[PDB]
């Protein structure tokens, strides 16, 4: 087990986002004491801060993360990729800090088809928001009230791929899946 600071805290105090310079420090990090931001500057680079663009392969470094005490904000993501592979092993989001003081998990306008958060089993506080992912299926299948642990939590799934359009293609929970829902089309992606 290893605890590491999040974006905006400690050595990342003025870091706007996980980027090519600071992603190395998250190696073997199983718990993040703070927030995680993934923004377009990450993959575009930033001249003023002398930050090179991020290699989408290095996002595998976060696979070891199993806990985040703050919130998770993903407003940018490589399009060649179909899901959030890096957060495969993320198990808990406590949301002691929250985006705008409300949201503990935000996915905004990604090319992903599935969330791919297999291990996520609790969201202690804060509201979930999944917005603008025009290819994202399987979202409404899961019962998010089972993950919530605080009263007042609500999910806001809007402007995403219509549930009917997802059904036509065949991108629905697998046969073996139970009513609990599914994170992806594969059985290993099932709750």
């Amino acid at each position: 087990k290893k605890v590491c600071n999040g974006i905006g805290i400690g050595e990342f105090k003025d870091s706007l986002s996980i980027n090519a310079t600071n992603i190395k420090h998250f190696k073997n990090c199983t718990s993040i004491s703070g927030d995680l931001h993934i923004l377009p500057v990450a993959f575009r680079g930033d001249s003023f801060t002398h930050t090179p663009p991020l290699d989408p392969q290095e996002l595998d470094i976060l696979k070891t993360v199993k806990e985040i005490t703050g919130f998770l904000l993903i407003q940018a993501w490589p399009e060649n990729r179909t899901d959030l592979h890096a957060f495969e092993n993320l198990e808990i989001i406590r949301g002691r800090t929250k985006q705008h003081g409300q949201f503990s998990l935000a996915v905004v306008s990604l090319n992903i088809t599935s969330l791919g958060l297999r291990s996520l089993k609790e969201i202690s506080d804060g509201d979930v928001i999944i917005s603008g992912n025009k290819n994202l299926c399987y979202a409404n299948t899961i019962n998010w009230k089972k993950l919530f642990g605080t009263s007042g939590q609500k999910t806001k799934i809007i402007r995403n791929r219509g549930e009917n359009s997802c059904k036509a293609t065949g991108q629905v929970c697998h046969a073996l899946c139970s009513p609990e829902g599914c994170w992806g089309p594969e059985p290993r992606d099932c709750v």
Partner: T-cell receptor
Amino acid sequence: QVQLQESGPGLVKPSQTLSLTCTVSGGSISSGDYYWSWIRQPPGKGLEWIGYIYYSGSTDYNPSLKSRVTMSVDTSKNQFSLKVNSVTAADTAVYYCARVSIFGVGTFDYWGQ
Amino acid sequence: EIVMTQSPATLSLSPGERATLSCRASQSVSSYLAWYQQKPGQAPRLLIYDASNRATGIPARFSGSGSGTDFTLTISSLEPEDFAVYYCHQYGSTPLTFGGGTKAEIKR
């Protein structure tokens, strides 16, 4: 304060391309909190959603326009633009630009003239 | 697309009356529905969002209810200013769609 204003030629010939640009004030279009959308209203009819553009370059377009729409941003001048090619009479309309607060109300809150 | 239907397309009403505007959806839009007001020459103005929450600066006489496929905008007492067209709007599924519009005309 937040203010949106449209600008562009009012007369386009059929089969040509329609170009509009929306100048934003009181805020930066480059932000993860806001979508930037175009809506149109043919004279005497309802409202049609065209699409939105996000600061990350992501876009969404209405299938009803059959891929004839593109949108771009110019963070330098704090503008975002709309291009619609192969226009006919059915594209005659009042074109509006509107903002959305992804983490606020969640729908068009500020409109242009 | 999710088609939004507003019936009737015209309401003849007198000042002080209670107006009731309806909006149906071909598919469930959960609670992700807004109401807009449009006066001739101006752009739509947001009244309600999440089907029931009034926006800032909207008199209390405006109110919304409903969920899923059937929604209602209620005006407790029409004022002279409230004679305009009202659109329902769904933001829950893309592509985004608007209702046909319901005009409120002065009865005489």
